[PDB]
Amino acid sequence: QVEAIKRGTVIDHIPAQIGFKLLSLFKLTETDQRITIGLNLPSGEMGRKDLIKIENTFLSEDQVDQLALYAPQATVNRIDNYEVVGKSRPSLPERIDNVLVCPNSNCISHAEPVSSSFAVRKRANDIALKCKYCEKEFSHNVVLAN
C-alpha cells in the first residue's frame, strides 16, 4: 500500500503494467526528489491497479489530461501536506506536444531542431492522431518507434 506522502502529487488508479510505462517513457526518473511507484497493487474501488505518488512534484493540468488516452479512468489525490486535495481528470486534450515520435518519416517534424506535436481527437472504436506539421492523421497506435 506504499505509505503516506507529505506534499506533492499522486495518481490513484493506474492501469496495471501501465504505471511502469507512464513512468519509464517520462522523466519521472530525472526527478531526484523521492518517488515510490507502486506498480501492480490492490485497488478497492476497482480490482487491480497502479498507484503513483511523486512527491515535491506538481502537475497542474497539462500532464493531467495527457493521460486520457492512456489511463482512461484514474484519480489525482493531490495530497498537499499529508492531506488529500485533488479534483482533476485526465481529459482528452487538444494536442499533446513534445513527447511522441512521428510515424511519417518524410514529415519534417524531426529532421529539424523543432519539437513534435500531434492533435488529439476521438475517431471511432479507437483514437487517431494528426501531426500538425504534415496534416497527416495516423492512428493513436501506429505513432511509435517499434
Binding site: 511519417n104 518524410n106 514529415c107 519534417i108 529539424e112 523543432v114 506539421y133 504534415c134 496534416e135 497527416k136
Partner: peptide, 13 residues
C-alpha cells in the same frame, strides 16, 4: 516549396 511534409509549417515558427 519544400520536398518534405509541412516544411512550410516549419517556416512560420
Amino acid at each position: 516549396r519544400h520536398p518534405q511534409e509541412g516544411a512550410a509549417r516549419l517556416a512560420t515558427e
